[PDB]
Design a protein around this ligand. Sequence first.
Ligand SMILES: Nc1cc(Cl)ccc1Nc1ccncc1
Length: 283
Amino acid sequence: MEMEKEFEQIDKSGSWAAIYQDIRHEASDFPSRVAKLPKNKNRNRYRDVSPFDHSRIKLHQEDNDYINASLIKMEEAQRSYILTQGPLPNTVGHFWEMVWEQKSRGVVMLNRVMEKGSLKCAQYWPQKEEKEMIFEDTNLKLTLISEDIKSYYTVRQLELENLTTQETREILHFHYTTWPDFGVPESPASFLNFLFKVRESGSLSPEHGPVVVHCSAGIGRSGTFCLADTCLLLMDKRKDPSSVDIKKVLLEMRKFRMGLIQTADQLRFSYLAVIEGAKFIMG
Ligand SMILES: Nc1cc(Cl)ccc1Nc1ccncc1
């Protein structure tokens, strides 16, 4: 079926939970043996969220190459994304090592450091120009260059230096700051505006390594971001945009990381975002 009318048909019939459970039942199951080794327990935020072995990102280290991060490679859309958990106190250096080694231009953050009164990820970037951060375990330096605070999101320019080679690179930090502590946003308008700002920066384009995107577990909000982006790109590329099947795209993405889209409300919000986004692209 088309998307907008399949949408109204699920609303009128109130069957979002049943649709979402079908997706959970059909989703791929692949091994995640490296994630579950005992030496990696303190590298995982949640015991039930792990990268598959076949798609995990490897750190360029001979001691321990493990990080909780997955490469989502969308062949028809010609887009790749790295989805990862919010960094832990003991994995902030690994996180920036990955950004460096994978040649990423941008980092997309979809959570606040504290939500619901608890810490959802480490404070992993500097908040003042004159107070830079040094990660001694991975030999990297990170400096805040500039910050632009808007009503729904903040964009930061950062300098990452590899202290071993003295090479430097400019990294863009796109921070969506207004996702509610509970539920999903009422309108997709600010989320779509944010996605378009990331696109306009070049961070999603083939001349760079994959964008790094995270929330707290790296599957819920993060899944919503890449699902919406890929579906809108496919609608632009195909002769028949109504052929794009968001459930099929989500199941394809779940071949590369488990659990993408965590609730039926996030599924409905993803449909809403793609539907509204497809009108603005054209009007
Ligand atoms: N809207 C639309 C519908 C059909 Cl059937 C064919 C072409 C368009 N136009 C497009 C196509 C691809 N990308 C943008 C616009």
